[PDB]
């Protein structure tokens, strides 16, 4: 049957937004003197789950946890 | 569990069903 | 006024032949031909389908 | 000398789009129609008007 | 004393692949370990950051953990099994593991024999 | 008590939810002991379906695949079923919804595909719809050739046999064993007196396109006999000759 042309039309959409990337974050979190004693830089988390593992993300003034939104002050 | 079987050539992975 | 001379054959687009397999000549031909019409016969209830019926 | 072989193939490639649709053509969305076609007009028929 | 102990870390490795025994990479191989569900770790020689090492041979002298080394991290990959694979077996992805850490064990009476006599030989 | 308004409140809410922040005591609804009594307060079933897709992505996002399996087999699975049976076509957030449901595949295929198709009332729009979303995700290979065993000991449908196309598509290496039960659900089809449709004989196609090369001798011969005892006039040819010219190891 009757087919069409296909107006083609440029629109460009190759700028997209993405989320920067961090290289190496595991770095920031233990600080280890020459001896080898393992110093935490990060508050740990006292949760009912997420314990023993899980850091707190330092805001300006207060911690923040990552798995279960825990604020404090 | 069939009565034909893969023979020979290998096993990579052994796979979990359990 | 009008007179247009070659316009639908100007038109239309070229579609190219396939390039398909001889045809038998001949004796052959004749035998293909004995062949599907009289020997591998399908029985039909009313025998209402041709040659080159298709759909 | 690779420059006049692209003509070649886009001389080709409208050729064929020319054959398969006699003369279409895109309208430009980044100019107005009227001022690109300012002297086209329409015919009722080819043959009378 | 009968194989090496080069066949006897892939056969734990595997092992652990049936029992869903790895913390793999960097992170899960780190909180795992400090969560002490961990059992054993493993080093890849060839790294580009050295307070990285410095660090997983703290975290494994805090709680007598112990290491071992493997000269290149590719090697390790393949090891580990992080490759994806086609029809006839062909690895396609190579990805490199750094640190891999082996948290449960199969019952093993050859690779664990093996490694346990070559801890004691270590310590 | 005082919950039990604010989870009426919050049912309200979700009854009308078209876009938009969402109360935070909808986003706690996992880390809750009781979620079930609340849950059914919410009334999953007067949701919308951007609710249900935003239900969805709490769920899956927050670990623990037993209870994203509960969730999927009681909640989204009859929602998905009741659209497609009424609508004849699947909404853009249900369609979502089960994509980001997928994003937990453990979950999602004792939960959803294989639960649809032990009903035995799945439709073929279903099956379509379904196949087509696990076709849109990239699946982990150990979870698609237990969905693939899973699939292929079951009693037939006709929606099955899609399913087992659309998993044979994805292209990944198979278990041996899987492929074994492939072999011997085909070698079951050999006795049936039933007429088959073009669907199976496209699923026999499917596995002798990608899985020719790891087909023994024996097995290789009683397709080509299933072949000569179940025909079609124009796929069997070509499933005969993509079996004569096949290759082993
Ligand atoms: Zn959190």
Redesign the pocket.
Same mark, same amino acid.
């Given at each position: 049957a009757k087919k069409r042309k296909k107006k083609s039309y440029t629109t460009p959409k190759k700028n997209k937004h993405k989320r920067k990337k961090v290289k190496l974050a595991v770095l920031k979190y233990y600080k280890v003197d020459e001896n080898g004693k393992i110093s935490r830089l990060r508050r740990e988390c006292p949760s009912d789950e997420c314990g023993a593992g899980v850091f707190m993300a330092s805001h300006f003034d207060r911690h923040y +946890?990552?798995? +279960? +939104?825990?604020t404090y002050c | 569990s069939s009565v034909m079987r893969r023979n020979e050539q290998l096993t990579l992975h052994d796979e979990r069903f359990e | 006024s009008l007179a247009r001379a070659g316009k639908v054959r100007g038109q239309t687009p070229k579609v190219a032949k396939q390039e398909k397999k001889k045809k038998k000549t001949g004796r052959a031909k004749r035998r293909m031909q004995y062949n599907r019409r009289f020997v591998n016969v399908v029985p039909t209830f009313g025998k209402k389908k041709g040659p080159n019926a298709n759909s | 000398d690779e420059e006049a072989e692209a003509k070649m193939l886009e001389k080709y490639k409208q050729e064929r789009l020319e054959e398969m649709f006699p003369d279409e053509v895109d309208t430009p969305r980044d100019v107005a129609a009227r001022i690109r076609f300012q002297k086209y007009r329409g015919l009722k028929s080819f043959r009378t008007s | 004393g009968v194989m090496d102990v080069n066949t006897a870390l892939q056969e734990v490795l595997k092992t652990a692949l049936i029992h869903d025994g790895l913390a793999r990479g960097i992170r899960e191989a780190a909180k795992a370990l400090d969560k002490r569900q961990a059992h054993l770790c493993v080093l890849a020689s060839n790294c580009d950051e050295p307070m990285y090492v410095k660090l997983v041979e703290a975290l494994c002298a805090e709680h007598q953990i112990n290491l071992i080394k493997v000269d290149d991290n590719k090697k390790l990959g393949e090891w580990v099994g992080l490759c994806k694979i086609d029809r006839e077996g062909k690895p396609r992805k190579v990805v490199g593991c750094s640190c891999v850490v082996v948290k449960d064990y199969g019952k093993e009476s050859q690779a664990k024999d093996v490694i346990e006599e070559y801890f004691k030989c270590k310590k | 008590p005082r919950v039990l308004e604010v989870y009426r409140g919050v049912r309200e809410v979700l009854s009308k939810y078209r876009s938009g922040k969402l109360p935070k005591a909808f986003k706690i609804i996992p880390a809750l002991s009781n979620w079930e009594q609340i849950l059914y307060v919410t009334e999953p079933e007067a949701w919308t379906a951007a609710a249900m897709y935003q239900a969805t992505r709490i769920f899956a996002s927050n670990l623990k695949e037993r209870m994203a399996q509960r969730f999927y087999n009681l909640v989204l699975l009859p929602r998905v079923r009741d659209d497609v049976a009424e609508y004849k076509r699947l909404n853009f957030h249900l369609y979502m919804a089960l994509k980001k449901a997928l994003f937990k595949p453990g979950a999602w295929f004792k939960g959803i595909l294989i639960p649809l198709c032990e009903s035995g009332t799945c439709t073929l729009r279903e099956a379509i719809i379904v196949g087509s979303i696990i076709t849109k995700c990239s699946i982990p290979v150990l979870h698609s050739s237990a969905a693939m065993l899973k699939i292929a000991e079951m009693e037939y449908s006709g929606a099955n046999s899609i399913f087992l196309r659309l998993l044979l598509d994805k292209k990944y290496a198979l278990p041996y064993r899987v492929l074994d039960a492939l072999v011997f659900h085909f070698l079951g089809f050999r006795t049936e007196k039933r007429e088959l449709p073009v669907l199976w004989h496209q699923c026999l196609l499917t596995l002798v396109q990608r899985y020719k090369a790891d087909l023994a001798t024996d097995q290789k011969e009683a397709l080509l006999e299933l072949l000569r005892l179940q025909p079609h006039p124009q796929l069997s040819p070509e499933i005969r000759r993509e079996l004569q010219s096949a290759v082993p190891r």
């Open positions: +946890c990552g798995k +279960c +939104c825990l | - | - | - | - | -």
